[PDB]
Amino acid sequence: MCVLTLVQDDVKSDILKLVLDFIKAVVVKDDEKVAFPEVRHEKKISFQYKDKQYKELFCTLYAIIDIYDCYNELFNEDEGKVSENEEFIFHLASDKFKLKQLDMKHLNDLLCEKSYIVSNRHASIVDIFYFCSVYKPLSEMPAKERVEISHIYRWFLHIQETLVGKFTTLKKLE
Amino acid sequence: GAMAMCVLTLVQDDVKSDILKLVLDFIKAVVVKDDEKVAFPEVRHEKKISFQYKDKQYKELFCTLYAIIDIYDCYNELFNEDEGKVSENEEFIFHLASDKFKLKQLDMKHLNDLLCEKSYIVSNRHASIVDIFYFCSVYKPLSEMPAKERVEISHIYRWFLHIQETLVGKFTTLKKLEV
């Protein structure tokens, strides 16, 4: 009925897994009757729901958001921050989901301002996208460099502890 | 008469609304054969993009675009699925969106190089979502360019006229160039 095919060791696939985990943690919560996709693994992302097939990250993402009726939660619509969320995720996608050292410095500066990258209330699609893109550089740097970006480090641990669930395959940092 | 239960609200003189109008024209021209058996939305011109279908409301370009693509079952055609080009189409449209639908002199040079040997930006077969996005984004700078400058991007100029004369239809409100 519902099958999400993902790619091992792929940031875009990590994003979709963390979106499902966000939906469970934030939107569905204790409603045990809600169905989630079966996850399978191949060389390209695709998603089949009923007789509809979606391919690649963004088409699949918008389909999932529609199915779970969670656009407002993921794009902070109630805060008037839809455009801000879009700006960030399209920028990161256009950058091939890569954050260089200067990008990390700027993200760390942004996270002094608020608890999340865009929202002042709760995690959004931008935090999900950035969590998966920060994972590699953060996991590869030592303690001193992590505390040089202490606002990223704190934010990352907070997302790890509050959103990561059954679908995410990224291991805890340390 | 009955009120419409399928309504697309768009913005005059807005590139993102022009994209949606051209998507509807593509659906009519490329996707649906007997357009009279297919329902199209009522189009309203207001200050924000939205789409209402029964009890569902979609707001802004990408939510509305994907809802339209879903209703008209035209993902394969718009994203060149039969060529294995969905990811390539996504790469372009989200690059342009991140650039707020603006092209610099350098982006024009690269697009002109890409179209040297190609009829379309991504597809080797027919227009795709990428041609639609780029057509609407290059309209203004091309329209303001003198002829001497358009021939310097002759591949863009040829591609643009070809999209204009093959896809632009009843929903598009942009004035045709070179008439």
Distinct helical segment count of chain A:
8
Order of helices and strands of chain A: EHEEEHHHHHHH
CA distance, first residue to last residue of chain A: 37 Å
Helix-residue proportion of chain A: 40-55%
CATH topology value of chain A: Glutathione S-transferase Yfyf (Class Pi), Chain A, domain 2
How many structural units, i.e. domains of chain A? 1
Give the biggest beta sheet of chain A: 4 strands, mixed
The chain pair forming the largest interface, with residue counts per chain, is: A-B, 22 and 19 residues
Spatial strand arrangement across the major sheet of chain A: 2-1-3-4
Strand content of chain A: 5-15%
CATH class of chain A: Mainly Alpha
